[PDB]
Amino acid sequence: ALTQPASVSGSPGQSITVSCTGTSSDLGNFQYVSWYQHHPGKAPKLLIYEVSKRPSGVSNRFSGSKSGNTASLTISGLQAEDEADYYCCSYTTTTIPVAFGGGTKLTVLGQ
Amino acid sequence: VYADSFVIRGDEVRQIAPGQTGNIADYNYKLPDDFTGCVIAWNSNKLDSKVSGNYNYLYRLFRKSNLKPFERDISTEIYQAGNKPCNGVAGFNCYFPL
Amino acid sequence: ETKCTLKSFTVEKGIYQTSNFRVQPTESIVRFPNITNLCPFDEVFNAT
Numbered sequence A: 001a002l003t004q005p006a007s008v009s010g011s012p013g014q015s016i017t018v019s020c021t022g023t024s025s026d027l028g029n030f031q032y033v034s035w036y037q038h039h040p041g042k043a044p045k046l047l048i049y050e051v052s053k054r055p056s057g058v059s060n061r062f063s064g065s066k067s068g069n070t071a072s073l074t075i076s077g078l079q080a081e082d083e084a085d086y087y088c089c090s091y092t093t094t095t096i097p098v099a100f101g102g103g104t105k106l107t108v109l110g111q
Numbered sequence B: 001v002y003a004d005s006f007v008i009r010g011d012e013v014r015q016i017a018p019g020q021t022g023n024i025a026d027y028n029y030k031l032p033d034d035f036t037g038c039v040i041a042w043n044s045n046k047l048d049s050k051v052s053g054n055y056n057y058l059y060r061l062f063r064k065s066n067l068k069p070f071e072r073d074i075s076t077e078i079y080q081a082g083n084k085p086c087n088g089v090a091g092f093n094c095y096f097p098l
Numbered sequence C: 001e002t003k004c005t006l007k008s009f010t011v012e013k014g015i016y017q018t019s020n021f022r023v024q025p026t027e028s029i030v031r032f033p034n035i036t037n038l039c040p041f042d043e044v045f046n047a048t
C-alpha cells in the first residue's frame, strides 16, 4: 500500500518535511513515484516526478529524496500561501496499479 | 587528503552521511553523493563543553535556498520573510540567521 | 630419477642428466625509508 501522515504543522518560514512509505511486497521495486499539490477550488499541478527530478516551472526550494522504503520532500522559505495538500502517487503491482497518498493538509501558525 | 573540524549538537552526527538531508545538511555542511573518504568521530565531552552553555560556537538555521556541497556560507545579513519591507534592524519576520 | 626420465625400467651405463640443484631462501627483509614529515593529524585532534 501507500501511506503518509494525515496532517502536519510547524513554524512559518522553514522546518517542514513530509514523507510517504509503503509495504515492499506490494510495491513494485519503487520507481516512478510523484509528488503533487492540490489547492481548494483550484486545479492540482505537478511538482516532482520520479523522486528527485525537477520539471520546468517549479522553484528550487522544492526538493525530494528517497531512502530505503521511505520517500520524502522538503521545502525551504515558506510563505503565507504555501499551505498545501501534498500527495504522493505511486505504482502498486498486486492491488490497483496506481495508489494516491493518504491525505495531507498543511497549516501555518502565522495568525 | 583534506580534513575539517566541527562541533555537532548531539544526535545529528548520524545525519552526517553521503546522501540524506537534515537540520545542518541543507544550510550547513553536507556530503555529496560520491563521497570518497569517511568520518572520524569521537565523544569529546572533555574539551568543547563548559558549564552554563557554550555561546562561542555558531550554526546557521535558514537560507534563501539549499546550498551545494563543499561550499562555505560566510555572509551575515538580516533575513526577511518573503515580501515584508524590513531592513537594518530586527523585529517582526526579521531574525538574524545565527 | 634416472629411470623416470627415460620411461624405462633399465638404464645403461654413462652420465645422465636430472633436475637442477635449487637452494631456497628462508625469510623476507623489507627496509623502506625512516618515517619523516609526519602529517599533522596530532595537532588537529588535540586542538584547543
Ligand SMILES: *[C@@H]1O[C@H](CO)[C@@H](O)[C@H](O)[C@H]1NC(C)=O
Binding pocket: C042, C045, C046
Ligand atoms: C594528543 O597528544 C597526546 C600526548 O600529549 C597523545 O598521546 C595523543 O595521542 C594525542 N591525541 C589526542 C588524544 O588528541
